[PDB]
Design an enzyme around this catalytic site. Structure first.
Site, PDB file in Angstrom:
ATOM      1  N   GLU A 124     -33.830  21.311  36.793  1.00 55.24           N
ATOM      2  CA  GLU A 124     -33.904  22.565  36.022  1.00 55.24           C
ATOM      3  C   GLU A 124     -33.983  22.271  34.493  1.00 55.24           C
ATOM      4  O   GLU A 124     -33.203  21.457  34.026  1.00 55.24           O
ATOM      5  CB  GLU A 124     -32.715  23.472  36.334  1.00 55.24           C
ATOM      6  CG  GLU A 124     -32.886  24.841  35.709  1.00 55.24           C
ATOM      7  CD  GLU A 124     -31.838  25.850  36.033  1.00 55.24           C
ATOM      8  OE1 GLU A 124     -30.975  25.537  36.863  1.00 55.24           O
ATOM      9  OE2 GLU A 124     -31.930  26.997  35.488  1.00 55.24           O
ATOM     10  N   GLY A 265     -22.988  21.140  31.624  1.00 56.33           N
ATOM     11  CA  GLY A 265     -21.792  21.091  32.519  1.00 56.33           C
ATOM     12  C   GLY A 265     -22.034  20.649  33.944  1.00 56.33           C
ATOM     13  O   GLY A 265     -21.477  19.676  34.362  1.00 56.33           O
ATOM     14  N   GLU A 268     -26.689  23.400  40.133  1.00 53.57           N
ATOM     15  CA  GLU A 268     -26.491  23.996  41.476  1.00 53.57           C
ATOM     16  C   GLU A 268     -27.508  23.538  42.553  1.00 53.57           C
ATOM     17  O   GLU A 268     -27.811  24.307  43.472  1.00 53.57           O
ATOM     18  CB  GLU A 268     -26.565  25.532  41.372  1.00 53.57           C
ATOM     19  CG  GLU A 268     -28.006  26.113  41.043  1.00 53.57           C
ATOM     20  CD  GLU A 268     -28.270  26.416  39.588  1.00 53.57           C
ATOM     21  OE1 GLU A 268     -27.635  25.798  38.673  1.00 53.57           O
ATOM     22  OE2 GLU A 268     -29.099  27.324  39.336  1.00 53.57           O
ATOM     23  N   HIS A 301     -18.772  28.201  39.340  1.00 52.66           N
ATOM     24  CA  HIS A 301     -20.111  28.607  38.867  1.00 52.66           C
ATOM     25  C   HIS A 301     -21.200  28.012  39.755  1.00 52.66           C
ATOM     26  O   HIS A 301     -22.076  28.720  40.229  1.00 52.66           O
ATOM     27  CB  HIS A 301     -20.227  28.224  37.410  1.00 52.66           C
ATOM     28  CG  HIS A 301     -21.543  28.590  36.783  1.00 52.66           C
ATOM     29  ND1 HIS A 301     -21.690  29.685  35.941  1.00 52.66           N
ATOM     30  CD2 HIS A 301     -22.754  27.972  36.817  1.00 52.66           C
ATOM     31  CE1 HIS A 301     -22.938  29.705  35.495  1.00 52.66           C
ATOM     32  NE2 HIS A 301     -23.608  28.718  36.064  1.00 52.66           N
ATOM     33  N   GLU A 302     -21.210  26.701  39.938  1.00 56.90           N
ATOM     34  CA  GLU A 302     -22.302  26.104  40.726  1.00 56.90           C
ATOM     35  C   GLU A 302     -22.252  26.615  42.178  1.00 56.90           C
ATOM     36  O   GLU A 302     -23.298  26.836  42.790  1.00 56.90           O
ATOM     37  CB  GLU A 302     -22.283  24.541  40.690  1.00 56.90           C
ATOM     38  CG  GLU A 302     -22.273  23.956  39.275  1.00 56.90           C
ATOM     39  CD  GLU A 302     -23.160  24.638  38.280  1.00 56.90           C
ATOM     40  OE1 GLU A 302     -24.282  25.140  38.631  1.00 56.90           O
ATOM     41  OE2 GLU A 302     -22.787  24.634  37.075  1.00 56.90           O
ATOM     42  N   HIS A 305     -23.817  30.122  42.475  1.00 56.71           N
ATOM     43  CA  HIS A 305     -25.263  30.061  42.451  1.00 56.71           C
ATOM     44  C   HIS A 305     -25.918  29.946  43.841  1.00 56.71           C
ATOM     45  O   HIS A 305     -27.135  30.193  43.991  1.00 56.71           O
ATOM     46  CB  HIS A 305     -25.725  28.860  41.642  1.00 56.71           C
ATOM     47  CG  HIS A 305     -25.931  29.104  40.201  1.00 56.71           C
ATOM     48  ND1 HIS A 305     -26.668  30.163  39.709  1.00 56.71           N
ATOM     49  CD2 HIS A 305     -25.626  28.331  39.127  1.00 56.71           C
ATOM     50  CE1 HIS A 305     -26.770  30.038  38.399  1.00 56.71           C
ATOM     51  NE2 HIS A 305     -26.139  28.946  38.021  1.00 56.71           N
TER      52      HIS A 305
HETATM   53  C1  LIG Z   1     -23.947  23.773  32.329  1.00 57.20           C
HETATM   54  C2  LIG Z   1     -24.510  25.018  31.758  1.00 57.20           C
HETATM   55  C3  LIG Z   1     -24.192  25.149  30.303  1.00 57.20           C
HETATM   56  C4  LIG Z   1     -25.899  25.138  32.208  1.00 57.20           C
HETATM   57  C5  LIG Z   1     -26.215  24.833  33.628  1.00 57.20           C
HETATM   58  N1  LIG Z   1     -27.632  24.734  33.474  1.00 57.20           N
HETATM   59  C6  LIG Z   1     -28.380  23.579  33.531  1.00 57.20           C
HETATM   60  O1  LIG Z   1     -27.966  22.474  33.919  1.00 57.20           O
HETATM   61  N2  LIG Z   1     -29.679  23.840  33.088  1.00 57.20           N
HETATM   62  C7  LIG Z   1     -30.657  22.816  32.681  1.00 57.20           C
HETATM   63  C8  LIG Z   1     -30.673  22.942  31.143  1.00 57.20           C
HETATM   64  C9  LIG Z   1     -29.549  23.100  30.338  1.00 57.20           C
HETATM   65  C10 LIG Z   1     -29.571  23.267  28.966  1.00 57.20           C
HETATM   66  C11 LIG Z   1     -30.742  23.303  28.252  1.00 57.20           C
HETATM   67  C12 LIG Z   1     -31.882  23.160  29.004  1.00 57.20           C
HETATM   68  C13 LIG Z   1     -31.818  22.997  30.376  1.00 57.20           C
HETATM   69 CL1  LIG Z   1     -33.305  22.839  31.155  1.00 57.20          CL
HETATM   70  C14 LIG Z   1     -25.941  25.939  34.595  1.00 57.20           C
HETATM   71  O2  LIG Z   1     -26.159  27.130  34.415  1.00 57.20           O
HETATM   72  N3  LIG Z   1     -25.575  25.371  35.762  1.00 57.20           N
HETATM   73  O3  LIG Z   1     -25.408  26.277  36.815  1.00 57.20           O
HETATM   74 ZN   LIG Z   2     -25.658  28.310  36.058  1.00 60.17          ZN
END
Ligand SMILES: CC(C)C[C@H](NC(=O)NCc1ccccc1Cl)C(=O)NO
Ligand SMILES: [Zn+2]
Ligand SMILES: [Mg+2]
Ligand SMILES: [Mg+2]
Ligand SMILES: [Mg+2]
Length: 890
Positions: A124, A265, A268, A301-302, A305
């Site tokens: 992602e 962090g 998912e 959170h994960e 999702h």
């Molecule tokens: C850990 C949080 C802050 C974000 C996490 N999202 C990600 O791992 N997204 C990939 C990503 C993060 C930050 C900036 C760009 C991207 Cl592609 C998320 O929503 N995981 O469910």
């Molecule tokens: Zn998330």
């Protein structure tokens, strides 16, 4: 720059039904062979077939086993692979590619990369295209068959999404494993891991269908003992989704994996959630208290999702908030239920009103569903996440629990196994709204403006009481400032949770009620109100707005003491502090600009200080709440109320206020610090990594907050207390001893002691780095230079880089040094970091977001550093977009 617009969404001309991968990991290269079983969609107009594919070295390309050649049937420019339409079949076909990639040198931590000795993916948002060719967008859903091979000695554990269906030996000391993921998914949810991992495991039996699920949590060998609380929090998350939402997990196994090098962090990936080690690993001997809260929220959170993002996914990236805002809301409901403390909701509010409100008043302001982007990565924002969560939470407030659950169920069922949009969610909520109102003409069309309209609404109040009629009115206005997204703003549907407090006895006067403001202004009238009330407004922080309560400090004090709602109490205290901050700020500012030899400051309200003492001394009042009342509002909250901010004048302001209050309360603070010791540092559960007492944690938070107050005050003999505190078995205590010792000669001895206690645990050392970085030290620049040379060195670990520098940027007096040397230092770190990790480089830009709020000399210095960064050759598209938007160029 290259710009994508929400309005231009079009379904693809192609379909990808099955993906079959062979990922062969060698020492100096990884070979990815991939067969895409594809078809032509109903939308096809005979276009070229264009795949995303970034930095791939092509070994071979074929369609239906016909080799295709560069320049003849395809072109590849390192970003897109174009198959000319003549060679694109008109019915079902197999596209094959074999490419070479290099995880060992992938320091951007996107795609396939090496974290210490673990090979791991992050796809992602746009990372799958760095592993192999794809139509790399979330509407291209497919089923995945994944084989991983590697050296058995180096990589004995191999994981990919879904059911492990075979394991085999391969000549030359290699081995393989094959995974089949039966759930259709977009490519952003693909994951693979390979390493020498250890695990803990448990079996979970689902509540309704009684399915056995095997739960595994993994780390490197050194830290396997730090996995237990994560496993417990997964069980908790599964139970909560069952109990609240009726949702059960949907595969036979769920793996969580910790890696040291991770941009955010966690992620998912279906059946294979990958985490930053800082958000999965803890032990009570080696982790600060806040680790336990962080792990609980990120595992939750994960997990959440799995439905809100995975089983129901995104039509396109403009819909990001549909999964993130909704999953943050789910996570927040979960956290509040597990911790059972009011500080949980307050911490979420604090974050929104500081960080998210600053973003929403900045040149980066966007709605929670943006209209455009260059790099989608720049839209993973506090707006999308945290304002999105509050928009998702307002549906619960408006509907109540029963009808909220009904609407959510309509959404999750109708769209299962498919993509969705923000409209689909609003439609499901609207069905519930019609049932709640018993009226098929009711609608939530206005609600959609929460998705499309940027900026924070300002909600203001006027009150009137008629003693003869026993009748009370609350007149409410909303305003949203025009901005670059809308020159004319429209009124929102704002739910206002309200109570009415009798000032005479402090008791509730009405059943709590939710006012539905839909116009630009409205007057709400209440009968049988027997005396003039004090209104308790936006209970629970019932909408994401600036609140202008128009209350006297006397009325605010009465709420702080007697109201039932924790947010309103907290907000009343916040408002008293803000009035005082703005007044003293203006006093100091006028005296500085006019070069006055003498002037006055407005003292802190003495009745407020008495109320703080009354609260602190009440043994039955909440310890976490107490730590919020003795703290001033965060600097990023305060800056939303000041233009042309002189940071040094603000620093002087805060010191004056703190000193005023401590001059009255320090003996109370000392007495409390000592009285709290027995219960706070009690070792019940110290060996139990499955249970945390959050109230006891809040007691430690309060003790450490008081100790900071007393240390800055040089309270008599407080150094003794600090030395004793440094021998506590809780790292929260012994690292606090380090930062509070900053006001004494003992600082460097405690720096050495705690270093030695921290240096053999990767994550504890990072907490030590942060503790140093945020230390209130006049020599902080020389300390940073020492951290760079002695500890950070050339590390590319984002956790190390963020540990050293980000806390320092919150040092109002020193980071904002009028020379600009703070700004220069962090701009150097951003430019350095951008050469290998563009995402972390943009994270490190966060201190610059407020540049246009500062006094004109600091505006100029910041602006000069931003323009210097923008001139860096080979600047990433991430950093360049961010900076161009931030400096009003895009
Ligand atoms: C850990 C949080 C802050 C974000 C996490 N999202 C990600 O791992 N997204 C990939 C990503 C993060 C930050 C900036 C760009 C991207 Cl592609 C998320 O929503 N995981 O469910
Ligand atoms: Zn998330
Ligand atoms: Mg490459
Ligand atoms: Mg969170
Ligand atoms: Mg390291």
């Amino acid at each position: 720059p290259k710009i994508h617009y929400r309005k231009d969404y079009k379904p693809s001309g192609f379909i990808i039904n099955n993906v079959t991968l062979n990922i062969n990991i060698h020492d100096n290269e990884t070979i990815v062979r991939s067969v895409l079983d594809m078809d032509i969609s109903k939308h096809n107009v005979g276009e070229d077939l264009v795949f995303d594919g970034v930095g791939l070295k092509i070994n071979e390309i074929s369609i239906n086993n016909k080799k295709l050649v560069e320049g003849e049937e395809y072109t590849y420019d390192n970003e897109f692979l174009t198959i000319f339409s003549k060679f694109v079949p008109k019915s079902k076909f197999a596209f094959s590619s074999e490419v070479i990639i290099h995880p060992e040198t992938n320091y951007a931590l996107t795609g396939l990369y090496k974290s210490k000795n673990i090979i791991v993916s992050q796809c992602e948002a746009t990372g799958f295209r760095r592993i192999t060719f794809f139509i790399d967008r979330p509407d291209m859903m497919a089923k995945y068959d994944v084989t991983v091979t590697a050296d058995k000695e180096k990589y004995p554990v191999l994981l990919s999404n879904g059911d492990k269906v075979n394991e085999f030996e391969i000549p030359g000391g290699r081995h393989g494993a094959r995974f089949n993921d039966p759930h259709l998914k977009p490519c952003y949810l693909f994951a693979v891991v390979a390493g020498d991992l250890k695990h803990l495991s448990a079996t979970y039996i689902t509540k309704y269908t009684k399915k056995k699920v095997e739960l595994y949590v993994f780390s490197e060998e050194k830290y396997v003992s730090k996995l237990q609380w994560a496993l417990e929090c997964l069980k908790k998350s599964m139970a909560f989704d069952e109990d609240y939402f009726g949702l059960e997990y949907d595969l036979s196994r769920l793996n969580l994996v910790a890696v040291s090098d991770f941009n955010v962090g966690a992620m998912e990936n279906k059946g294979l959630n990958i985490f930053n080690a800082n958000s999965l690993l803890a032990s009570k001997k080696n982790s600060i208290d806040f680790s336990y809260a962080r792990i609980l929220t990120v595992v939750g959170h994960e997990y959440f999702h799995n439905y809100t993002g995975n089983r129901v996914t995104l039509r396109d990236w403009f819909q990001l908030t549909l999964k993130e805002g909704l999953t943050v809301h789910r996570e927040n409901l979960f956290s509040e239920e597990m911790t059972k403390t009011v500080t949980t909701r307050l911490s979420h509010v604090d974050l929104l009103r500081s960080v998210q409100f600053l973003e929403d008043s900045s040149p980066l302001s966007h709605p929670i569903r943006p209209e455009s982007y260059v790099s989608m990565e720049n839209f993973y924002t506090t707006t999308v996440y945290d304002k999105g969560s509050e928009v998702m939470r307002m549906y619960l407030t408006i509907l109540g629990e029963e009808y909220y659950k009904k609407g959510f169920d309509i959404y999750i069922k109708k769209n299962d196994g498919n993509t969705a949009t923000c409209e689909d969610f609003n439609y499901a909520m609207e069905q519930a709204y019609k049932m709640k109102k018993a009226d098929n003409s009711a609608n939530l069309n206005q609600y959609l403006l929460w998705f499309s309209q940027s900026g924070t609404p300002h909600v203001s109040f006027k009150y009137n009481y008629d003693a003869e009629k026993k009748q009370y009115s609350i007149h409410v206005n909303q305003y949203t400032k025009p901005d670059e997204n809308q020159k004319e703003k429209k009124p929102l549907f704002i739910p206002i949770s309200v109570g009415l407090i009798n000032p005479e006895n402090g008791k509730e006067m009405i059943s709590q009620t939710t006012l539905e403001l839909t116009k630009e202004s409205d007057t709400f009238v209440f009968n049988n109100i027997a005396v003039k009330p004090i209104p308790s407004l936006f209970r629970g922080f019932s909408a994401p707005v600036y609140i202008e309560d128009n209350l006297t400090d006397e009325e605010r004090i009465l709420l702080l003491k007697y109201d039932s709602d924790a947010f309103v109490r907290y907000n009343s205290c916040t408002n008293i502090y803000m009035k005082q901050i703005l007044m003293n700020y203006n006093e100091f500012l006028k005296a500085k600009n006019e070069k006055l030899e003498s002037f006055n400051l407005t003292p802190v309200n003495a009745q407020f200080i008495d109320a703080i003492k009354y609260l602190l001394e009440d043994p039955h009042a909440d310890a976490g709440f107490k730590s919020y009342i003795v703290s001033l509002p965060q600097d990023r909250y305060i800056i939303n109320f000041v233009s042309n901010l002189d940071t040094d004048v603000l620093a002087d302001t805060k010191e004056y206020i703190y000193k005023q209050i401590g001059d009255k309360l320090n003996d109370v603070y000392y007495k409390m610090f000592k009285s709290l010791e027995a219960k706070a540092d009690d070792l019940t559960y110290f060996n139990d990594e499955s249970h945390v007492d959050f109230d006891q944690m809040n007691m430690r938070t309060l003790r450490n907050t008081l100790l900071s107050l007393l240390s800055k005050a040089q309270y008599p003999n407080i150094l003794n207390e600090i030395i004793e505190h440094s021998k506590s078995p809780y790292p929260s205590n012994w690292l606090t001893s380090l930062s509070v010792s900053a006001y004494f000669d003992k600082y460097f001895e405690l720096y050495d002691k705690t270093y030695k206690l921290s240096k053999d645990d990767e994550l504890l050392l990072q907490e030590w780095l942060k503790t140093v970085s945020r230390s209130d030290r006049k020599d902080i620049y020389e300390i940073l230079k020492k951290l760079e040379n002695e500890v950070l060195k050339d590390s590319k670990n984002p956790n190390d880089i963020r540990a050293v520098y980000l806390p320092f940027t919150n040092n109002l007096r020193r980071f904002h040094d009028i020379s600009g040397k703070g700004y220069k230092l962090i701009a150097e770190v951003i430019t350095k970091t951008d050469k290998f990790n563009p995402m972390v480089a943009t994270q490190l830009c966060e201190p610059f977001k407020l540049w246009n709020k500062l006094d004109t000399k600091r505006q100029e210095l910041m602006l000069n550093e931003m323009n210097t960064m923008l001139q860096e050759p080979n600047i990433s598209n991430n950093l360049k977009e961010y900076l161009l938007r931030l400096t009003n160029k895009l």
